[PDB]
Design goal:
This protein has 118 residues and is largely without helices or strands. Helix content is 11%, strand content 8%. Strand 3 and strand 4 form a beta hairpin. The structure holds zinc ion (4 copies). The site of one zinc ion has 8 residues, from loops. It is found in: Nucleus; Cytoplasm.
Length: 118
């Protein structure tokens, strides 16, 4: 993975935008790295991205089937940034959801902190 943040060219030692140290997050696939805050993640997302092998937008696959086809149907979870095809969920979705959307894994983990709530 890259020892530098794509967005600020900084380190784990220095976020060049904020001035403080901040762990890098790396694409588990192509290695590109960013600071969670440079990636503009909510501090809930900034967390959850570290509990699994995060994939950047270019490398993202459906967590369910594993393929990267049908990008026009690949939903992003607003908490963990994993991808889920609408047709892989149960029930199937015919339409993209409205507003925030939280996947099952985040509902179980983040509970009331998931985006889908108030
Ligand atoms: Zn950065
Ligand atoms: Zn990638
Ligand atoms: Zn799928
Ligand atoms: Zn999620």
């Amino acid at each position: 993975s890259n020892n530098y943040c794509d967005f600020c060219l900084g380190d784990s030692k220095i976020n060049k935008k904020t001035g403080q140290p901040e762990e890098l997050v790396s694409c588990s696939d192509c290695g590109r790295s960013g600071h969670p805050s440079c990636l503009q993640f909510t501090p809930v997302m900034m967390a959850a991205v570290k509990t699994y092998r995060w994939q950047c937008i270019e490398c993202k696959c459906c967590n369910i089937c594993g393929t990267s086809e049908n990008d026009d149907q690949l939903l992003f979870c607003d908490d963990c940034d994993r991808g889920y095809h609408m047709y892989c969920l149960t029930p199937s979705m015919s339409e993209p959801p409205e507003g925030s959307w939280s996947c099952h894994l985040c509902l179980d983990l983040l509970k009331e902190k998931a985006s889908i709530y108030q």
